[PDB]
């Protein structure tokens, strides 16, 4: 087991060095895009507004950056610490997703966020394991109806345990990995790829924050942000049931 | 139990509503001031440059915001995927910290990052549980030598288990909380609070990405950023290992 652990360490190290080579190869050529776009914006603004020196448009951007840095939104609601978005932010902590698309400015908020997390995350892990067992119980009994169909067609009952486990991961993959992506695709105006990326980045609790649903109160479909809160709970709980049986079989073998 | 399950859901709901009230109370005044400051900057710039409509200066800020959002630096006019930082980025995925201080531009990178995570995270959870059981054995085994002295001086054996467990968490807290915060405090030029914040946000794997060690454009510290990950491994395994031994002595 000592020998295996380092074999597994060396595997993971080569898995990261391999990842590092790939991401570099794909992403390094498009490092400079954002900066080129900012410069392209400056140069067009100067060409269009001649009473503006390059250096004066320089200080504007730095001052604009500092306001955006302090949490300002380009105005053309937007409040990201209204009770809705603050509730959402609190949720990104206890879920350990931590998008960071809206970051804390105050030392008070950072100090608070520490104790909020240390009490909140484990409190949530108990509810997650609780909803994980409950939703999994309901679902495996629900498949018990389709298991009855396969038993009457005289199929070996251990093949039915695999077919049920396959249906178990596909029925919830339909409800938590496909349904949301098609929802987000239309609601957020993302591409089908951008949507699946967000969904998986979220449910893995990696939560980069490059893409966020947001939980900002709006209309056109006011029943959207309420169902996005609810989805992450159910989706994370759905993973847990799966990743414990995959994790249980990989550590015993 | 369905009764306890719903009581737990109401508890967590009030825990988030309570968090929401607090964060708003602490953060929102700063945010709304920042908004006033943006508007103050616009109004000041219009008054200085009359060849610019309000609405045209509107689009500039939107476009400038979006470029800054994409990671453009206000300071220059013109590597975050050097082998060091790309290795680090890969580390933020399998650890499920996911700082996201440098995010992926290509569809290729995002599609790859999906399969990289679905394979990587559980592969790491096995190493974490492996180092966790190993690291926990070594400390409880190692302290057992120093624990022996206190048992012979006739402190009740249930209370020496607590004293050992206290020393066990304080030696680990020293090595994987206090040591790193004092390190980052000097290395990154953060405040002692900013450092503890980062450390805890990292080890909780919340990984906001507002603060990232080795991110600094200036630093030519090649071993530093990967070597921070050596800490992250040990810290997360300790964070895991101690909370699971806590779980055994509870249940």
């Amino acid at each position, epitope marked *: 087991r000592s020998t295996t652990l380092l074999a597994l360490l060396a595997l993971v190290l080569l898995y990261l060095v391999s990842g590092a080579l790939v991401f570099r190869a794909l992403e390094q050529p498009h490092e400079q895009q954002a900066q080129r776009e900012l410069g392209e914006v400056r140069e067009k603004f100067l060409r*269009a*507004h*001649p*009473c503006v020196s390059d250096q004066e448009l320089g200080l504007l951007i730095k001052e604009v950056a500092d306001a955006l840095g302090g949490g300002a939104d380009p*105005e053309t609601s937007h409040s990201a610490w209204d009770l809705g978005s603050a509730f959402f932010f609190s949720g990104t902590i206890i879920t350990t997703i931590g998008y960071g698309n809206v970051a804390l400015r105050t030392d008070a908020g950072r100090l608070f966020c520490i104790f909020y997390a240390l009490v909140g995350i484990p409190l949530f892990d108990i509810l997650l394991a609780g909803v994980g067992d409950r939703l999994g119980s309901s679902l495996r009994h629900g498949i018990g109806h389709i298991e009855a169909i396969f038993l009457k067609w005289h199929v070996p009952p251990e093949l039915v345990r695999v077919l049920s486990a396959m249906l178990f991961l596909l029925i919830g993959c339909l409800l938590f990995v496909l349904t949301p992506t098609f929802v987000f695709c239309y609601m957020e105006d993302w591409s089908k790829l951008e949507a699946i990326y967000f969904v998986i980045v979220t449910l893995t609790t990696v939560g980069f924050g490059d893409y966020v649903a947001g939980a900002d109160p709006r209309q056109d479909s006011p029943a959207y942000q309420p169902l996005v809160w609810f989805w992450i709970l159910l989706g994370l709980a759905y993973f847990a049931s799966v990743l414990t049986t995959i994790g249980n079989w990989l550590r015993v073998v | 139990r369905s009764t306890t399950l719903l009581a737990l859901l109401a508890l967590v709901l009030l825990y988030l509503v309570s968090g929401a009230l607090v964060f708003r109370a602490l953060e929102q005044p700063h945010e709304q001031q920042a908004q006033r400051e943006l*508007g*103050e900057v616009r*109004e000041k710039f*219009l*008054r200085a440059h*009359p*060849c*610019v*409509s*309000d*609405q*045209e200066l*509107g689009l500039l800020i939107k476009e400038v915001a979006d470029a800054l959002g994409g990671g453009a630096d206000p300071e220059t006019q013109s590597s975050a995927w050097d082998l060091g930082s790309a290795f680090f980025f890969s580390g933020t995925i399998i650890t499920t910290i996911g700082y996201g201080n440098v995010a992926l531009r290509t569809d290729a990178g995002r599609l790859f990052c999906i399969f990289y995570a679905l394979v990587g995270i559980p592969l790491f959870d096995i190493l974490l549980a492996g180092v966790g059981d190993r690291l926990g054995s070594s400390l409880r085994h190692g302290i057992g030598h120093i624990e022996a002295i206190f048992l012979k001086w006739h402190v009740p054996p249930e209370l020496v288990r607590v004293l050992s467990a206290m020393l066990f968490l304080l030696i680990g807290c020293l090595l994987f909380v206090l040591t790193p915060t004092f390190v980052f405090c000097y290395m990154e030029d953060w405040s002692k609070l900013e450092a503890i914040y980062f450390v805890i946000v990292t080890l909780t794997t919340v990984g906001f990405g507002d603060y990232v060690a080795g991110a600094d454009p200036r630093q030519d510290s090649p071993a530093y950023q990967p070597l921070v990950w050596f800490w992250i491994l040990l810290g997360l395994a300790y964070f895991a290992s101690v909370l699971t031994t806590i779980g055994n002595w509870l249940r």
Partner: antibody
Amino acid sequence: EVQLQQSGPELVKPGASMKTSCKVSGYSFTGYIMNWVKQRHGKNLEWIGLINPNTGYTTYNQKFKGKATLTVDKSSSTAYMELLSLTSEDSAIYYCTRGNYVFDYWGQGTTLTVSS
Amino acid sequence: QIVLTQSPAIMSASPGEKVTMTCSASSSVSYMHWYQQKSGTSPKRWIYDTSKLASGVPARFSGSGSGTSYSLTISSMEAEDAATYYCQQWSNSPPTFGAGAKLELKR
């Protein structure tokens, strides 16, 4: 001495369109934003829209979006406003005025009369 | 469309009287501007950036305020001060005006 000189008063049939003009002087036409304001039988002043005569950029009051079309002629340093499918409600005084925060110099005004 | 409210819409003063007309904004505003219009003629910028006098404007006129509540004040009413005063705002697009305050002479 800065001066906005509007075209005379126009009288058009209901349903027809109207174009009125405003020639600036004492400054650089292209150097400042031109606005148009409606004052309706001497009551509260309505900002119709602005044009950046240098860029040709136009934003309108959502109320006037379909009615008004602002254009300039850089060469003659003249701003134009065109009102479309006119109703008796459009009979007003219309001012071109200069500014990007305060309307510092105004034209003499032009009086539109929609009437059969 | 920030609402400016000039109440009362009509007011009178004997010459030598202090006049103070006011303009309240539906939401906060960084600076208020004021126009003087005399019947027959277009408006003329009177006070801009809240308390700044446009060139012709005599010293007896004065502006002040902040937030949602601004005021144009004449220390000592004159005959030639009798006109309509409008408050304007361009702290948010679109810019908007008051109803106007019509100031008549008292005799």
